[PDB]
Amino acid sequence: AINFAYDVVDPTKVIKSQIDSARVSFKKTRETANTLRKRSLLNAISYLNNVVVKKECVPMRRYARGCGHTRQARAFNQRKGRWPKKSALALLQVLENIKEQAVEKGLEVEKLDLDHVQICRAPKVFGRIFRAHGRVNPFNKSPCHILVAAKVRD
Amino acid sequence: SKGTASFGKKNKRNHTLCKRCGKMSYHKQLRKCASCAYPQPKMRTPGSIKARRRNALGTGRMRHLKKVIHEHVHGKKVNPILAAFWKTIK
Amino acid sequence: MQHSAVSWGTGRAIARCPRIGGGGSRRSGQGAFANFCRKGRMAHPTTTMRRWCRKI
Amino acid sequence: FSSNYADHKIDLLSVENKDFPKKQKKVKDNRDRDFG
RNA sequence: UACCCACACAUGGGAUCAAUAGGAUACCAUAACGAUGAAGGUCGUAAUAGAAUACGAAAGUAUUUACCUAAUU
RNA sequence: AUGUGUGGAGUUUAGCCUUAUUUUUAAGGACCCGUCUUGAAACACGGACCAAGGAGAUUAUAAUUAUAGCAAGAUAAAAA
RNA sequence: AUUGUAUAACUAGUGGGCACAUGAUUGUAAGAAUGAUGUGCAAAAAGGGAUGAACCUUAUGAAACAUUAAAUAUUCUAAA
RNA sequence: UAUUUAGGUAGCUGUGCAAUUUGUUUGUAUUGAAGUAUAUAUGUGAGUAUAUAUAGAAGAAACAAAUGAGCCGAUCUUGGAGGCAGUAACAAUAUAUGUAUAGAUAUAGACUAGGGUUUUCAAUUUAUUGAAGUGAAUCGGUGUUAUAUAAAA
RNA sequence: UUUAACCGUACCUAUACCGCAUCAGGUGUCUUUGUAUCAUAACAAAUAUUUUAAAUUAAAGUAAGUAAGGGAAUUCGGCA
RNA sequence: GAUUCCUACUGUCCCUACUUACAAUUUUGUGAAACCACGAGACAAGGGAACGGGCUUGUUAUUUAUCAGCGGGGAAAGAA
Ligand SMILES: [Mg+2]
Ligand SMILES: [Mg+2]
Ligand SMILES: [Mg+2]
Ligand SMILES: [Mg+2]
Ligand SMILES: [Mg+2]
Ligand SMILES: [Mg+2]
Ligand SMILES: [Mg+2]
Ligand SMILES: [Mg+2]
Ligand SMILES: [Mg+2]
Ligand SMILES: [Mg+2]
Ligand SMILES: [Mg+2]
Ligand SMILES: [Mg+2]
Ligand SMILES: [Mg+2]
Ligand SMILES: [Mg+2]
Ligand SMILES: [Mg+2]
Ligand SMILES: [Mg+2]
Ligand SMILES: [Mg+2]
Ligand SMILES: [Mg+2]
Ligand SMILES: [Mg+2]
Ligand SMILES: [Mg+2]
Ligand SMILES: [Mg+2]
Ligand SMILES: [Mg+2]
Ligand SMILES: [Mg+2]
Ligand SMILES: [Mg+2]
Ligand SMILES: [Mg+2]
Ligand SMILES: [Mg+2]
Ligand SMILES: [Mg+2]
Ligand SMILES: [Mg+2]
Ligand SMILES: [Mg+2]
Ligand SMILES: [Mg+2]
Ligand SMILES: [Mg+2]
Ligand SMILES: [Mg+2]
Ligand SMILES: [Mg+2]
Ligand SMILES: [Mg+2]
Ligand SMILES: [Mg+2]
Ligand SMILES: [Mg+2]
Ligand SMILES: [Mg+2]
Ligand SMILES: [Mg+2]
Ligand SMILES: [Zn+2]
């Protein structure tokens, strides 16, 4: 029951969807979703399938220390790029669910646009490891919340 | 070695159950309990101050002393067949 | 003052205050027997020796 | 608004052993300028 | 694009304030165990039973009281 | 300790004090606090960050100062 | 020259010091060691010696205006 | 009527602000008390007063009293969460149709000590729940002793 | 011959034991096929497990090979 | 076991060169630790607690915000 930080001016023609505490790493889904805003919904699903088959890359901007250079990141005027698998499959499941509510409410699929995309941190899940000389160190992981809203064009 | 290589050789068990106390502290070669000292009649004095808390009088069931306290406050109900008989004693 | 703690000493990159010995739980290794320790007794404990009445 | 069924969703089984792995012991038990 | 600042809205965590079938101290009464088998322990009994709690083959609501136990042909 | 949206500066210099409607700049001043030490910004020690906790109180016996009741006398000793 | 002088009672900190000017003892000599008289830093602001615990002018609440001391007047930097 | 006095480490004395509880007097509150977050005024200063949003049940002032009575530090105690950093360190056999055709690494199987349902099956995804399963005159113990408590070889 | 009482009979031998662990360590006894002119070493049977990133191109590492002519001149020492 | 000399032998050396595998360089998945007064660019001389990253006079860097190496310094980290 995470609330949205989106301010809705028209209650009709706004579609929201949500996944809470997904089991994907936080720093990698933040890197993929930075360029999804102000796009058509049809261009987004075509773009995310090219990341899985390694034909388009993701430009690392915030957390980017130690990433290999490539030539596919010239489209963003960048010099770093990577292709995360598991982060793209979690975002693809959200965009299909938006497409199903549009045909149930009878809206037109081509006219939609992505408007509000934010993710945030989540409570941890703890773990363990056993190192040399008999010492024990933590081995925990960090999930995230995913929030996406779609709006029709004018 | 003294460390990891010698902990594989520990597969012999020395202490077993006791009859009187119920702990696993009865030596099978020395033939003596390490907590209650079983073959002696009197029980062993405990080792510390906290050890008197763990098995004192009153943490058990008190199958008899619950009755004896209850006849102190309220009177004892008598059997009428037994009450008539005791008056016929010399 | 119920426990049986003792200081470990120097040479371990740790403070001097008395530590709970033993093992096997989250409790073992914590401080005790001081007024600035959690679940420790306070310095200068109150008592019933205090004068309760005055004389006029 | 609404959450859906997914294979990347959380589990209630993992939360049981997670708090079990969160309680242990925190602390446990040729030099410089050498001459004879 | 990254780095910095200002404002508005959402995550993370359990501090502050208010409550309370819990504790601490002083005083008054009692000061009742056991071979007629004590204190303590092990195993069993619920129509669908695990923890806790009560109870002994008469067993999960005025009598009975399984086996060790001072345990005693 | 982080996320989203809007607005603003520059790439040659963090934060602070004084004076100025050229206040996301200009001119002057200005080494990091606590502590032993004749002497610390020191190539002397402690301190990565927030919340809550944390150290001259009590008793007996003496003495000086201030105050109250009675005064050649003064007093709630145990008890009734 | 001084409007007071004199007398009692109670109680804290300190007992590792260093520097400048004048003059000495030991030592080849030392930012070395140890005594004598005065004033300082320790515990003392602002201005000047580019910078410096002790050198030179100089007595202490918050400000504004005029006059000097120590030191300076090609430029950084107020002033032939 | 300071035309005279005013710096200050160790140290001594005076006037004042903050917190919890007790006796007496005065007063507030469901058209909204205590807490918290932003502004404004006021005090040399410890601090105080008011305004707006949120929340939902009790709190303030004066004259006197009792102290467990005011933190940046102690390699201080307990909890929560950073940078370094998605960095070190570990895991990654072939087939257009397959309950098969091939490749690759490792000798294998029984009694005792230790473990105790991990056994088998069904349903749902080295997990969770529920049923079923151990049959002895001739296989072990129970027997004798090791020169006043001893053998599963 | 309603004669032969009482207790244990599932499963694991190392990813079902002990070393805080699905740890290159440790742990009593026995059995095990074929070629192998002393044997050893080695290979094959038997039985049990196992699914999908790139590559003629770095430097410096951990292992294994080869070297014209000279033959201890290297070095504390023919250490390797 | 400790020490010296002859014969054979050799990349120990003159003086180094070439080939292969595994880690490393490139991709996906699981995902830590030591350390941290502030570190916002680096030097020459000065004085100073007599060997400054910061103080005083001088000389100076800058690729859209990188990637892979290296061991001069941080009187580098461990242990009152
Ligand atoms: Mg790298
Ligand atoms: Mg490891
Ligand atoms: Mg170990
Ligand atoms: Mg042995
Ligand atoms: Mg023995
Ligand atoms: Mg306590
Ligand atoms: Mg300056
Ligand atoms: Mg000194
Ligand atoms: Mg120095
Ligand atoms: Mg040092
Ligand atoms: Mg430190
Ligand atoms: Mg506090
Ligand atoms: Mg001093
Ligand atoms: Mg001065
Ligand atoms: Mg000079
Ligand atoms: Mg001029
Ligand atoms: Mg003063
Ligand atoms: Mg206190
Ligand atoms: Mg604090
Ligand atoms: Mg302090
Ligand atoms: Mg901590
Ligand atoms: Mg690997
Ligand atoms: Mg099972
Ligand atoms: Mg069987
Ligand atoms: Mg069997
Ligand atoms: Mg074995
Ligand atoms: Mg093993
Ligand atoms: Mg290569
Ligand atoms: Mg050769
Ligand atoms: Mg040759
Ligand atoms: Mg030679
Ligand atoms: Mg030579
Ligand atoms: Mg050799
Ligand atoms: Mg490789
Ligand atoms: Mg320099
Ligand atoms: Mg010098
Ligand atoms: Mg680098
Ligand atoms: Mg020392
Ligand atoms: Zn016993």
Residue A141 bridge partners (DSSP):
A125
Do D and B make contact via 3 or more CB pairs under 8 A? The reply is no
CA dihedral (A23, A28, A32, A33) in degrees, to 10, reads 60
Identify the chains in contact with C, defined as 3+ C-beta pairs within 8 A: D
Reduced to 3 states (helix: H, G, I; strand: E, B; else coil), residue A128 is coil
Q: Which residues does C8 contact at the CB level (< 8 Å), separation at least 6?
A: C14, C19, D29
> What is the D21 CA–ligand 9 centroid distance (Å)?
50
Residue A32: count of CB within 10 angstroms of its CB: 23
CB of A130 nearer than 7 A to strand I: yes
Experimental method for this entry? cryo-EM
| E strands in chain D | none
Q: How far apart are CA C39 and CA B64, in angstroms?
A: 39
Residue of C nearest to D23 (CA): C26
- Around ion ligand 39, residues with a beta carbon closer than 5 Å are B 18, 21, 33, 36, 38
Cα distances (Å, whole numbers) of residue A151 to A11, A38, A39, A135, C19: 10, 10, 11, 53, 62
> What is the B28 CA–ligand 5 centroid distance (Å)?
9
Which nucleotides of strand E are protein-proximal, with an atom < 7 A from a CB? 1-3, 8-13, 25-26, 30, 32-34, 38-42, 55-56, 62-63, 65, 68-71
What is the separation, in whole angstroms, between the first and last Cα of chain D?
A: 78
If residue A46 lies in a helix (H) or strand (E), which one and from where to where? helix A41-52
Sign of CA dihedral C36, C38, C40, C43: positive
Identify the chains in contact with D, defined as 3+ C-beta pairs within 8 A: A, C
CA dihedral (A30, A34, A39, A45) in degrees, to 10, reads -40
Closest Cα of chain A to D16: distance in Å? Answer: 10
Q: How far apart are CA C2 and CA B50, in angstroms?
A: 8
B56 CA → E38 C1’, Å: 14
Order of strands across the sheet with A14-22? A14-22, A144-152, A112-121
Helices (H) and strands (E) counted in chain B, each on its own, are 2, 3
Cα distances (Å, whole numbers) of residue A98 to A15, A38, A107: 7, 16, 11
Cα distances (Å, whole numbers) of residue A71 to A33, A51, A57, A84: 21, 15, 9, 17
